[PDB]
Amino acid sequence: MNGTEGPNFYVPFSNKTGVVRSPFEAPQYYLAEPWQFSMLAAYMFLLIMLGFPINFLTLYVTVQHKKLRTPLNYILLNLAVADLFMVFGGFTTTLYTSLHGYFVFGPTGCNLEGFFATLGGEIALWSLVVLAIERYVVVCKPMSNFRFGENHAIMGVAFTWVMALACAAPPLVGWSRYIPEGMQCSCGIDYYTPHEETNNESFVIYMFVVHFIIPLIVIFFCYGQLVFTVKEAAAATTQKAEKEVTRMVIIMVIAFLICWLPYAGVAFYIFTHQGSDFGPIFMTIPAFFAKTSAVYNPVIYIMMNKQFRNCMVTTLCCGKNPLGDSTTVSKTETSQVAPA
Numbered sequence: 001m002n003g004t005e006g007p008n009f010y011v012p013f014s015n016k017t018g019v020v021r022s023p024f025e026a027p028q029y030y031l032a033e034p035w036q037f038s039m040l041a042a043y044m045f046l047l048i049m050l051g052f053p054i055n056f057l058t059l060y061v062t063v064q065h066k067k068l069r070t071p072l073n074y075i076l077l078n079l080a081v082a083d084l085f086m087v088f089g090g091f092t093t094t095l096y097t098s099l100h101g102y103f104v105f106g107p108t109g110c111n112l113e114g115f116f117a118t119l120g121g122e123i124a125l126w127s128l129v130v131l132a133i134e135r136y137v138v139v140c141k142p143m144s145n146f147r148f149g150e151n152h153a154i155m156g157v158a159f160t161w162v163m164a165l166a167c168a169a170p171p172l173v174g175w176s177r178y179i180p181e182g183m184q185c186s187c188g189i190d191y192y193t194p195h196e197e198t199n200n201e202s203f204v205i206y207m208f209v210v211h212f213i214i215p216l217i218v219i220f221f222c223y224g225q226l227v228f229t230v231k232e233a234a235a236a237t238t239q240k241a242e243k244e245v246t247r248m249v250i251i252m253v254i255a256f257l258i259c260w261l262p263y264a265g266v267a268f269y270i271f272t273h274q275g276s277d278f279g280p281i282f283m284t285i286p287a288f289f290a291k292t293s294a295v296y297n298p299v300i301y302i303m304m305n306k307q308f309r310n311c312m313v314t315t316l317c318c319g320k321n322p323l324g325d326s327t328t329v330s331k332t333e334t335s336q337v338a339p340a
C-alpha cells in the first residue's frame with residue numbers, strides 16, 4: 001500500500017518500514033524535515049499575527065461607523081467575523097499542530113482545524129453568491145422600485161452561515177469526516193478513503209456539487225449578465241459608485257479562485273485516485289496557501305473601497321483627516337442621515 005490507512009486517518013507515506021505512526025500520537029518528522037514543520041508553524045504564526053488585527057479592525061470600523069450598512073458592508077463584516085473564527089478556532093490548532101509535528105490535540109484538534117477552515121471558506125463562497133445577486137439587482141435593476149436594505153442584507157448573511165454550516169457541519173456528526181492532510185498538520189474532508197461506514201464518496205460528491213460547482217455556476221452566470229450594464233473599466237454620477245463596487249466584487253471572486261482552485265483540484269484529484277502514490281507535500285502547499293483566505297478579503301476591501309478606507313483612517317486617527325482623493329459615516333461627527 002502506497003499509503004497507510006488508519007481507522008482515523010491516512011498517512012500518504014508507506015509503512016513497509018514501520019516508521020509510520022498516527023498523526024494523532026506522534027511527530028510526522030519522517031514525512032519531511034523538522035524545519036519544514038517549523039516553516040509551517042512560522043507561516044501560521046504570521047497568519048494569526050495578521051488575520052487577527054486586519055479582520056478585527058474591519059469589524060470595529062464597520063460597527064463604529066453607523067452608516068456603514070450597505071449589503072457590501074454587511075457581507076464584509078460577516079467575512080471579518082468568519083475570518084476571526086478561522087483564526088482562533090482552527091488556526092490556533094494548526095499553528096500548534098505544526099509546532100509539535102502532529103495533532104497533539106487528537107481528532108478534536110483535527111476537527112477544530114478542519115471545521116473552522118471549511119466554515120470560513122464556505123461562508124466566503126456563499127457570501128460571494130449573495131453579492132453576485134445584490135449586484136445583479138443594483139445594476140440590472142430588476143424591480144422598478146427596489147434597493148436592498150439591512151433587512152435583506154441580514155438575510156444574505158444569515159443565509160451564508162446556513163449554507164456554510166450545511167457544508168462544514170456534517171463531518172462532525174456522521175457524514176464524512178475531518179482528517180489530517182499533507183504533513184498531517186491541517187485537517188480536511190476525507191477523499192483518501194472510501195470508508196463505507198461514514199459515506200465519504202457521497203458527501204464529497206455532495207460538497208463538490210452543492211458547495212462548489214453550483215455556487216460557481218451561479219456567480220459566473222450572474223457575471224455573464226452584468227458584463228453588459230457594468231461592463232468592465234473604472235476610474236447618474238451614482239453610476240460610478242456601483243460600477244466601482246462591482247469591480248471589487250469581481251476581484252474578490254478572482255481572489256477566491258486563486259485561494260481555492262489549486263486546493264480543490266488537488267482534493268478532487270486524490271478523491272478519484274485514492275491509494276495512489278502521492279506524498280505529504282503534495283497537499284500541504286495548496287492547503288496552507290489556501291489559508292490566506294482568512295485574511296485577503298479585508299485587504300481588497302480597504303484597497304478598493306474609498307469609503308471604508310477613509311472610515312478606517314478616520315477611526316485609526318480617532319477623529320478625521322483620511323488622506324484621500326464620497327458620502328460619509330461615523331459616530332459623533334456627521335453620521336447624520338439624509339433619506340427621502
Ligand SMILES: *[C@@H]1O[C@H](CO)[C@@H](O[C@@H]2O[C@H](CO)[C@@H](O[C@H]3O[C@H](CO)[C@@H](O)[C@H](O)[C@@H]3O)[C@H](O)[C@H]2NC(C)=O)[C@H](O)[C@H]1NC(C)=O
Nearest residue numbers: 003004005006011014015016017018019020021022023025
Ligand atoms: C508500521 O508498522 C509498525 C510495526 O511494523 C507499527 O508500529 C507498531 O506501533 C504500535 C503502537 O500502537 C506498537 O505497539 C505498542 O502498542 C501499545 C500502544 O497502544 C504500547 O503500549 C506497547 O508498548 C506496544 O509496543 C508496536 O510495537 C509497533 N510495531 C512494531 C515496531 O513491532 C506502526 O503502527 C505501523 N504504521 C501504521 C500502520 O500506523
Ligand SMILES: *[C@@H]1O[C@H](CO)[C@@H](O[C@@H]2O[C@H](CO)[C@@H](O)[C@H](O)[C@H]2NC(C)=O)[C@H](O)[C@H]1NC(C)=O
Nearest residue numbers: 001002003004014272273274275276277278279
Ligand atoms: C500505488 O501508487 C501507484 C502510483 O499511482 C499506483 O500505480 C498506478 O496504477 C494505475 C492503475 O492501478 C496505473 O494506471 C498507473 O499507471 C499507476 N501510476 C500512476 C497512477 O501514475 C498503484 O495503483 C497504487 N496502488 C494502490 C491502489 O495502493
Ligand SMILES: CCCCCCCCCO[C@@H]1O[C@H](CO)[C@@H](O)[C@H](O)[C@H]1O
Nearest residue numbers: 066067068069070071241242337338339
Ligand atoms: C451604494 C452606496 C449608496 C448607499 C446606499 C446603501 C444604504 C446603506 C446606507 O444607508 C443609510 O443607513 C443609515 C443607517 O443604517 C440610515 O440612517 C440612513 O437613513 C440610510 O440612508
Ligand SMILES: CCCCCCCCCO[C@@H]1O[C@H](CO)[C@@H](O)[C@H](O)[C@H]1O
Nearest residue numbers: 232233234251252254255256258296300
Ligand atoms: C487578488 C486578485 C487579483 C485581481 C486580479 C487583477 C486583474 C484585474 C485587472 O485586469 C485588467 O482590467 C482592465 C479594466 O477592466 C482591462 O481593460 C484589462 O484588459 C485587464 O487585464
Ligand SMILES: CCCCCCCCCO[C@@H]1O[C@H](CO)[C@@H](O)[C@H](O)[C@H]1O
Nearest residue numbers: 233234235244247251299300303304305
Ligand atoms: C488585494 C486587492 C488588491 C488588488 C487590486 C485589484 C485590481 C483592480 C484595480 O482597479 C482599480 O482600483 C482602484 C482602487 O483605488 C480604483 O480607484 C480604480 O477605479 C480601479 O480601476
Ligand SMILES: CCCCCCCCCO[C@@H]1O[C@H](CO)[C@@H](O)[C@H](O)[C@H]1O
Nearest residue numbers: 261262263264265266269277278279282
Ligand atoms: C486547478 C489547479 C489545481 C491543480 C490540480 C492538481 C492535480 C495535479 C496532480 O497531477 C498528478 O500528480 C501525481 C504526482 O503526485 C502524478 O503521478 C500524476 O501522474 C499527475 O497527474
Ligand SMILES: CCCCCCCCCO[C@@H]1O[C@H](CO)[C@@H](O)[C@H](O)[C@H]1O
Nearest residue numbers: 013030031032278279280281282283285
Ligand atoms: C506538489 C509537489 C509534489 C511533491 C509531493 C511529493 C512529496 C515529496 C517529498 O517527499 C519526502 O521527501 C523527503 C526528502 O527526500 C523524504 O525524507 C520523505 O520521506 C518524503 O516523504
Ligand SMILES: *C/C=C(C)/C=C\C=C(C)\C=C\C1=C(C)CCCC1(C)C
Nearest residue numbers: 117118121122186187188212260264
Ligand atoms: C487549513 C485546513 C483546510 C484547508 C481545511 C479544509 C478545507 C476544505 C474542506 C475546503 C472546501 C472548499 C472551499 C472552502 C472552497 C470551495 C471548494 C471546497 C468545497 C473544496
Ligand SMILES: *C(=O)CCCCCCCCCCCCCCC
Nearest residue numbers: 052053054056057313316317318
Ligand atoms: C491619524 O491619527 C494618523 C494615522 C496614524 C494611524 C495609523 C497607524 C497604523 C495602524 C495599524 C493598524 C493596527 C490596528 C490594530 C487592530 C487590532
Ligand SMILES: *C(=O)CCCCCCCCCCCCCCC
Nearest residue numbers: 312313314315316317318319320
Ligand atoms: C487616536 O486614536 C490616536 C491617533 C494615533 C496616534 C499615532 C501614533 C502612531 C505611532 C507612531 C510611533 C512612531 C514610531 C517610533 C518607533 C519607536
Ligand SMILES: [Hg+2]
Nearest residue numbers: 132222223226
Ligand atoms: Hg454578478
Ligand SMILES: [Hg+2]
Nearest residue numbers: 258259292296
Ligand atoms: Hg488567496
Ligand SMILES: [Hg+2]
Nearest residue numbers: 307311328329
Ligand atoms: Hg467614511
Ligand SMILES: [Zn+2]
Nearest residue numbers: 122163164167
Ligand atoms: Zn457550504
Ligand SMILES: [Zn+2]
Nearest residue numbers: 194201271274
Ligand atoms: Zn472514493
Ligand SMILES: [Zn+2]
Nearest residue numbers: 259262263286
Ligand atoms: Zn488552493
